[PDB]
Amino acid sequence: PISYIIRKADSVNKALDSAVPLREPLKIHEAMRYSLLAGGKRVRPVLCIAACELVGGEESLAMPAACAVEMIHTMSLIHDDLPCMDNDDLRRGKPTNHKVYGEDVAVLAGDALLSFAFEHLASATSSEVSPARVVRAVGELAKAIGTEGLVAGQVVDISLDLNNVGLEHLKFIHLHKTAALLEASAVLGGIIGGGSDEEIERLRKFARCIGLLFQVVDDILDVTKKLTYPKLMGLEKSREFAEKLNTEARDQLLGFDSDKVAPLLALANYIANRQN
Numbered sequence: 056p057i058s059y060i061i062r063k064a065d066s067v068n069k070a071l072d073s074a075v076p077l078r079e080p081l082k083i084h085e086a087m088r089y090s091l092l093a094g095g096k097r098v099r100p101v102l103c104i105a106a107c108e109l110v111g112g113e114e115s116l117a118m119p120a121a122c123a124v125e126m127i128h129t130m131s132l133i134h135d136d137l138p139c140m141d142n143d144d145l146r147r148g149k150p151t152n153h154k155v156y157g158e159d160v161a162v163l164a165g166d167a168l169l170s171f172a173f174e175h176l177a178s179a180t181s182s183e184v185s186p187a188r189v190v191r192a193v194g195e196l197a198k199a200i201g202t203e204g205l206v207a208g209q210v211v212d213i214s215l216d217l218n219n220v221g222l223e224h225l226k227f228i229h230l231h232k233t234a235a236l237l238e239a240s241a242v243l244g245g246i247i248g249g250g251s252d253e254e255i256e257r258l259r260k261f262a263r264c265i266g267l268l269f270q271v272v273d274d275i276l277d278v279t280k281k282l283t284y285p286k287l288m289g290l291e292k293s294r295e296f297a298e299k300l301n302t303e304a305r306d307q308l309l310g311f312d313s314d315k316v317a318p319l320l321a322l323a324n325y326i327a328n329r330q331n
């Protein structure tokens with residue numbers, strides 16, 4: 056439950072602190088840490104860890120990979136927040152990177168977090184993991200985040216007959232800007248933990264489903280307290296869609312070890328039933 060996530064999130068925080076220490080050049084490291092070590096919920100690295108354990112791995116095996124996906128998540132925010140893109144002065148209720156360090160330092164801090172993600176995944180992953188698996192991890196991670204994946208979502212996310220193309224655009228953006236990196240987290244965990252190719256594909260589909268589910272539920276909450284699921288399919292159909300995503304995510308975990316699969320089932324039904 057929230058306890059599993061809170062506790063794994065805490066171990067991730069400590070790992071991130073350790074992975075990117077303050078050293079020379081100091082400013083750049085401060086700027087990287089400012090953003091990396093802020094208050095993310097850490098869902099991506101925790102899903103990574105969870106996926107590793109689901110397949111019989113241990114948290115320690117996946118921890119470098121988990122840190123990499125969070126570094127990549129962090130760098131995406133840093134760049135998205137720049138004036139030339141979303142122009143966010145605030146995120147997490149705090150000044151954004153470029154507001155504290157300048158746009159220049161913010162771009163560089165994102166660049167160094169992207170590259171270090173790969174350095175860390177490649178260099179810090181235990182030698183018990185077969186290098187073929189680490190190569191695959193590198194490739195999955197890069198693919199998930201470039202032009203087929205995340206960046207595609209960002210270039211599309213610009214704001215048309217919404218009745219002809221609105222739903223298609225909405226699913227596209229969410230699949231690309233949310234599901235893609237959650238898919239990479241789960242896939243990297245499965246890969247690094249020794250999962251079969253079948254197991255990896257079930258984890259990929261699970262992650263896609265809970266990625267869409269997060270956004271559908273967020274939209275329902277927003278109206279029961281921009282283009283949205285309630286606007287484009289109505290609220291009832293939005294609720295039916297979230298329930299079908301919850302079911303589908305659960306169905307993907309059919310066939311895994313009964314005890315091992317609880318934290319993922321708990322995460323699906325938690326995301327699904329968010330009250331706040």
Ligand SMILES: CC(C)=CCC/C(C)=C/CC/C(C)=C/CC/C(C)=C/COP(=O)(O)OP(=O)(O)O
Pocket residue numbers: 094095096097098127130131132134135147200201205206209232233
């Ligand atoms: C990765 C490469 C190659 C370039 C980055 C391309 C960019 C700038 C993409 C846009 C990234 C973006 C704004 C993605 C949305 C991510 C998202 C779902 C953010 C909110 O997620 P939470 O998990 O709630 O955030 P916390 O970390 O605060 O928990």
